[PDB]
Design a protein around this ligand. Structure first.
Ligand SMILES: COCC(=O)NCc1nc2ccccc2[nH]1
Ligand SMILES: COCC(=O)NCc1nc2ccccc2[nH]1
Ligand SMILES: COCC(=O)NCc1nc2ccccc2[nH]1
Ligand SMILES: COCC(=O)NCc1nc2ccccc2[nH]1
Ligand SMILES: COCC(=O)NCc1nc2ccccc2[nH]1
Ligand SMILES: COCC(=O)NCc1nc2ccccc2[nH]1
Ligand SMILES: [Zn+2]
Ligand SMILES: [Zn+2]
Ligand SMILES: [Zn+2]
Ligand SMILES: [Zn+2]
Ligand SMILES: [Zn+2]
Ligand SMILES: [Zn+2]
Lengths: 360, 360
């Protein structure tokens, strides 16, 4: 059984479980079950399964070096798939809700879920709530008697919370902090004083890294009962680095990747996002370039968006990206080495995570 | 210390904990902390604290009949307040998101949270996510070493899930089940075949009863380590009854309570809600009254709304409500008696829950 095959089969099983339970324990009728099946498929499937497959890969590594009965190998791999789906369904939650929050049009060359004719925002908000509730239903069902259940739920819960806090950092990133006030409509920053590397780093760490990198690695350790093979402060450091890198790639592609390939028309400029491009450009621009960026950023007008893209093009941001990439490659290699002291197997899984990130 | 006083003090403590942790562990800055404090107050405070105070009342009952050290009495009451706030913050989540889902204008004579000028939907969806995450942060913090932690989290998780399923039943209640399809925009029912008492009962049970009645009672038992004093199938039955009653009152008031008193302009008729009024009217109407209801229900037009209110007025629904009330009074009394066999104290708390519901 290829890992991916096992992973995909477990989706089918988990889907059947959740829908069969709705019918037998929550009085659902067949049509509403079908609507939820479609919802689940539409919102959970079609991506790369990077996060969920990380859990599987980490567990697979430990299986190769640890003595177990066959049935135990199976149970561990099944747990790693369930845990991976918990993360994918968490992601699915965040995507449904974020797309609504941001008025997004497309996700993976298909309409965002709320835009489906028979969905609408009124249902989609709640569908997103259900998606995250299913992570917990999965956990309580499949992991009821597992020794790792407490630690898994407690971590999962902190990562979800961090992610929501990250969302708040992201949606408020173009405001002046000192002006935040629920009573007063929020103006866009004029000075862009908060477009700094440390501020950017805080957004990305919370919004993406905890759930995309830390949680899949640590879930893999927890289902393997292997958290003693690592120094958790290192696993955090390496996840922060790789996660930051991931987002900087995504930020560049929002701007420069053709929409057919991206699967999306990128709107970070019109949305006035604190992107790596913006922060990096502000870190090297001259006064006249800074005034021009300010006159044009955060505006729907396509000509103003083209002015911003031009400023970025002539600012030679490809140099800054190569240098940044160089330095991340350097630090990731260093942390992989430190990880080898307690676990070659876990260090190797992080190596694979990094290769898959660095080459995508 | 009056119970309410203790309850309100614990809000202050919990608020400080959550905000202090954001600063010390999640890198929050002071302005975003202030925004979340305001959010928390605006969305969690100002109601009757019925659900949270139920937890406190149930625990207080057991304290009066159970031998404990003073510090243990305090710890139990503190736990009951924390558990009660978990339920109020769960409620706060659902209200923020539902108000957004339904395009609601006012909640408790104040603007819905998403309508605040400095909030907007983009932030409000996420603020609602945070509210529910805080229930879990509270639980893991205050109840880390508690013997009831597992059972409390597992119940809490099932009630939340049921509530989301209830929301789906509610928002789809004016559609024909056989027509639900994410690909096709959903027409309002023309036949109203699904406006039945059993269907209505399913909506209310899921949408309201589990979180408003079952969870506060059972939370009170769990923090008291008293679940053996009751037959859980009875506690479920009595909660379903009282919870149904609560909603039937709310349904009548949406239609007949002046907006100043309601704290809201009621829109259940324009929203084509499967209300008790509608279901009860359809259960007694003649053919001509049925055609008239169909020609007028579920429409913004104020004259069509007034036609519906007239049909309800002349259908003598006050008689049906008195008869329904009569029968609920009868069954609640019967279940209170059954509850006395294992626990007079718990039966008495349910009596208080019912009095507070029946007289509001
Ligand atoms: C077909 O069964 C209908 C029913 O009410 N079952 C029991 C039941 N449903 C619950 C939901 C949440 C928490 C606890 C619950 N217990
Ligand atoms: C859909 O059913 C969910 C469920 O858990 N049913 C059993 C159940 N019901 C409970 C009520 C209180 C405490 C614990 C309970 N356990
Ligand atoms: C209550 O209405 C909310 C709203 O209009 N939100 C933006 C929105 N834009 C859409 C485009 C296509 C389909 C659905 C869409 N929804
Ligand atoms: C001020 O501290 C910043 C930091 O990163 N602390 C550790 C940390 N933050 C976590 C969030 C979720 C899950 C696990 C976590 N561990
Ligand atoms: C805001 O801090 C949240 C936190 O839990 N910090 C400690 C912590 N970090 C962990 C990473 C993996 C496993 C367990 C962990 N525990
Ligand atoms: C992205 O926009 C969503 C939207 O317009 N939702 C309805 C809506 N109606 C409002 C009335 C006052 C204040 C805020 C309001 N929001
Ligand atoms: Zn977003
Ligand atoms: Zn940590
Ligand atoms: Zn992006
Ligand atoms: Zn609603
Ligand atoms: Zn039950
Ligand atoms: Zn109502």
């Amino acid at each position: 059984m290829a890992s991916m095959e096992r992973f995909l089969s477990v989706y089918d099983e988990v889907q059947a479980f959740l829908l069969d339970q709705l019918q037998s324990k929550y009085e659902i009728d067949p049509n509403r079950a079908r609507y939820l099946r479609i919802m689940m498929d539409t919102t959970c499937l079609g991506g790369k399964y990077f996060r969920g497959m990380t859990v599987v890969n980490v567990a697979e590594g430990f299986l190769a070096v640890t003595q177990h009965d066959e049935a135990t190998k199976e149970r561990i791999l099944h747990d790693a798939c369930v845990g991976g789906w918990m993360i994918e369904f968490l992601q699915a939650h965040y995507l449904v809700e974020d797309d609504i929050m941001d008025g997004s049009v497309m996700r993976r060359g298909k309409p965002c879920w709320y835009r489906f004719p028979g969905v609408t925002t009124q249902c989609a908000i709640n569908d997103g709530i259900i998606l995250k509730s299913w992570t917990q239903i999965m956990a309580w069902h499949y992991f009821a008697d597992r020794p790792f259940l407490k630690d898994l739920l407690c971590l999962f819960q902190k990562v979800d919370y961090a992610t929501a806090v990250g969302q708040m950092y992201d949606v408020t990133s173009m405001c002046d902090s000192n002006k935040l006030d629920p009573e007063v409509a929020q103006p866009m920053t004029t000075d862009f004083a908060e477009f700094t590397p440390a501020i950017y780093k805080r957004i990305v760490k919370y919004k993406t890294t905890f759930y995309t990198y830390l949680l899949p690695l640590v879930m893999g350790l927890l289902v393997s009962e292997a958290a003693a093979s690592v120094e958790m402060n290192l696993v955090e450091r390496v996840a922060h680095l790789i996660g930051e890198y991931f987002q900087v790639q995504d930020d560049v592609m929002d701007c420069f990747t053709p929409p057919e390939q991206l699967g999306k028309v990128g709107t970070d400029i019109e949305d006035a996002k604190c992107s790596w491009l913006a922060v990096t450009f502000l870190g090297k621009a001259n006064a006249a370039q800074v005034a021009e960026f300010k006159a044009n950023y955060g505006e729907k007008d396509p000509a103003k968006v083209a002015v911003v893209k031009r400023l970025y093009s002539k600012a030679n941001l490809q140099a800054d990206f190569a240098a940044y990439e160089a330095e991340v490659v350097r630090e990731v290699e260093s942390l992989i080495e430190q990880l080898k002291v307690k676990s070659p197997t876990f260090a190797e899984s992080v190596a694979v995570v990094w290769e898959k990130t660095h080459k995508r």
